[PDB]
Design a protein around this ligand. Structure first.
Ligand SMILES: Nc1ncnc2c1ncn2[C@@H]1O[C@H](COP(=O)(O)OP(=O)(O)O)[C@@H](O)[C@H]1O
Ligand SMILES: Nc1ncnc2c1ncn2[C@@H]1O[C@H](COP(=O)(O)OP(=O)(O)O)[C@@H](O)[C@H]1O
Ligand SMILES: Nc1ncnc2c1ncn2[C@@H]1O[C@H](COP(=O)(O)OP(=O)(O)O)[C@@H](O)[C@H]1O
Lengths: 89, 89, 89
């Protein structure tokens, strides 16, 4: 059963409306009906103390795409990628 | 050198025989002769304080499959997926 | 936009010139002009307290390859793999 993994990297100090962006992302994920999310905190990072936050979502491609369309209206740096995975039931 | 990544997401409060399921998984992994395992703890998650636990195993497909056959007899929710990776020697 | 994910697993107690190897890796990554790195610490692991350290780099294949050529001169155990991902802009 084919799915996409969506991985989002951002900083903990990143804000949306003064409030933590990663919390806002997890909350949009939930409001959109995503199957789930897992959030990690790193110990070190750089892109281009403010620690990496990483979200992983495994969902149907259509759902990841819908979420991507929301993420688009948000200015943060970090990184977004997807990858194909096979979910086992 | 082709391998599979197997990724398992579960809750920290999940139990097998009253004892922590993630510890039981790591222990089966070891008893089966898996090449390795890495275990992470998240800071937030949801599916469908109890924090996400994630296991990653990179191994031969045959081995991941054998492990899958054990995981099948266990009732937990969470998520299991595999993905192709290329291991460098 | 195709990229590679490079994932490196090593122990926290691993050393390069008496100094922590993971810090040395992150520092080479930066000196080579990698697009970024994210570093995680696990809670448990085995291969074949010394906790897993995991680095993730998402970059152009050419860059990951160049980094691989440096990693080659270093003796540590752990694990290195790559995987194809699609970065969204
Ligand atoms: N190419 C990448 N590979 C792995 N992690 C990355 C990459 N790009 C960004 N990240 C992660 O995202 C975090 C946030 O990125 P970024 O905002 O661009 O800025 P910064 O350099 O100030 O941390 C980084 O610190 C890093 O952990
Ligand atoms: N589709 C998913 N994507 C990313 N992480 C997931 C997904 N599904 C489940 N998880 C992770 O697995 C954890 C355990 O899942 P679950 O048992 O289904 O219940 P819960 O909602 O009570 O946390 C979740 O909290 C989450 O971290
Ligand atoms: N096949 C693997 N799958 C997942 N993680 C691995 C794998 N191989 C190694 N690792 C991670 O790398 C860490 C360092 O590996 P290793 O040096 O080989 O020795 P050790 O058994 O002494 O921890 C492991 O503890 C583990 O977290």
């Amino acid at each position: 059963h084919h799915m996409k993994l969506l991985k989002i990297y951002l900083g903990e100090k990143d804000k949306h409306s003064g409030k933590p962006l990663f919390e806002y992302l997890v909350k949009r994920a939930y409001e959109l009906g995503m199957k789930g999310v897992t959030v990690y905190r790193g110990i070190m990072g750089f892109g281009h103390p403010d620690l990496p936050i990483v979200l992983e979502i495994v969902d149907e491609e259509e759902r990841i795409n819908l979420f991507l369309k929301e993420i688009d209206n948000i200015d943060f740096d970090g990184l977004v990628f997807t990858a194909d995975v096979n979910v086992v039931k």
